[PDB]
Amino acid sequence: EDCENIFHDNAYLLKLDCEAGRVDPVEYDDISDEEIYEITVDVGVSSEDQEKVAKIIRECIAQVSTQDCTKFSEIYDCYMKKKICNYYP
Amino acid sequence: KCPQPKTLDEFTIIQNLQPQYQFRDYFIATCKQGYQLIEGNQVLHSFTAVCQDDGTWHRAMPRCKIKDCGQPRNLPNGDFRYTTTMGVNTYKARIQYYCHEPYYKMQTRESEQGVYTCTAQGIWKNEQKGEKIPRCLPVCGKPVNPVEQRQRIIGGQKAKMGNFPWQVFTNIHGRGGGALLGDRWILTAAHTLYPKEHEAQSNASLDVFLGHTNVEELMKLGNHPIRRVSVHPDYRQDESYNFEGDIALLELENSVTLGPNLLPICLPDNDTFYDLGLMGYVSGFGVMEAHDLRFVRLPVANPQACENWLRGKNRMDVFSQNMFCAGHPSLKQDACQGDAGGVFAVRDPNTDRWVATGIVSWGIGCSRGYGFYTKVLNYVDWIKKEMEE
């Protein structure tokens, strides 16, 4: 339950930063596998679930092509369709 | 006719060398600058010698060795490097003082304030203020491991070491927070040390911890004693509805040693930090003790919408100009995410120095809504006044 709330809040904060002209929406679509791994180990997912989480992340960044401030709102939606929070404690 | 006095070394100068020395005649031996009379292993302030009839001087001429300024004075939170020969503290020796960067910075007025030489008087001196050594002042903001500005949706609120090196933990009446100012002062909320509803007799205990992110390691690091408490007079404990002047300063009995995990934070100057839309980070050790430190980024909103929400939620309300609200109702997390009486850390992109703009004051509504803080910029003068005491 708390995982979904944290993700929604981070998405809304990124939307506000985009409305302020500080974080460009296209720049967000770039992230290396090392960054994904370090984020997944810092949040506390299992070492086995990291592959599923990376697949979900790649697919969700792929499915969202709208380059606007609502991008962060749509990506979040995808993360709920793939049920990514089940790989978190 | 005792023999003519002969200088042993080169720096010995006989004052008025007479052509011949007879009975009851004397000669005085001084030394050049930077050198001192010795005679054996001791030191002499003056030497004179006379003839004892049998042509023998009653005492032998001294040696006149060089003066030793001694070991240089210790620079607090600093050190020195031998610009000349190491271990040689004698006459004509230069040292270079330096401060422990990045946690401390030498006070300014550039290859002129940290250089100290050994003078002929026998002490380490500098061209400006010779007797006294410099002073390394603490660097306020500029955290050595700042939080990543590339925020992602998948973002754990757990803070890492060095992100907020100013966070403190207090277990006075309950779990509270604050920020470090300098190496000796702690800025916190007034209602953390004075209970609002409880009041009456105080179960005094205090205890202040800082230096880590995990609670157990914070406790292991040590309890810091407090020697003076300065509460703003506007705060009143009986008025449980009001929180005006919710600010206080604590003075440590001994100054802390600043490091990569322990750094203070600067005070505001211009009001551009309180502008709408500014993202401020609020840290706290969670509620319902929860272990490690957790942070949350919240935006400062319009005070008018906050007042509308306040009076619409049938609340007494105690908003003022010295306060500013943060957060958004669309945020699905609780309004108490400003855990403990911490601070509202905002980073100034012009100077890249983090500054504490607000203090976690009152948030009546542990469910959802806005958060309220106290403008530090308004109480800057009182903070500086209490610090200069």
Author numbering:
A (entry chain A): 24 to 112
B (entry chain C): 308 to 416, 421 to 600, 604 to 703
Extract from the study:
Whereas previous studies on salivary gland extracts from the sandfly Lutzomyia longipalpis identified SALO (salivary anticomplement from L. longipalpis) as a potent inhibitor of the classical complement pathway (CP), its precise mechanism of action has remained elusive. We found that SALO inhibits the CP by binding specifically to the zymogen form of C1r. We provide two crystal structure determinations and supporting functional studies which show that SALO binds tightly to the zymogen activation loop of C1r preventing cleavage of its scissile bond. However, since the C1r zymogen undergoes autoactivation over time, we expressed an engineered fragment of human C1r consisting of its two CCP repeats and its serine protease domain, wherein the catalytic serine (S654) had been mutated to alanine (zC1r-12SP).
The asymmetric unit of the crystal contained two copies of the eSALO-WT–zCr-12SP complex, which superimposed well upon each other (RMSD = 0.34 Å across 444 equivalent Cα positions); thus, our subsequent analyses focused on the eSALO-WT–zC1r-12SP complex represented by chains A and C. Whereas the eSALO-WT–zC1r-12SP interaction buried ∼1100 Å2 of surface area at the interface, the most extensive interactions between the two proteins were centered upon the zymogen activation loop of zC1r-12SP. Consistent with this, EBI-PISA identified 13 likely hydrogen bonds and four candidate salt bridges between the residues lining this channel, including N33 and Y/X51 (explained further in the following subsection), and residues from the zymogen activation loop of zC1r-12SP, which is composed roughly of residues V458-Q468 inclusive. At the periphery of the eSALO-WT channel, the side chain of E58 formed a salt bridge with the side chain of R461 from zC1r-12SP. Based on the geometry of this electron density, we suspected that Y51 had undergone post-translational sulfation during eSALO-WT expression and secretion from HEK293(T) cells.
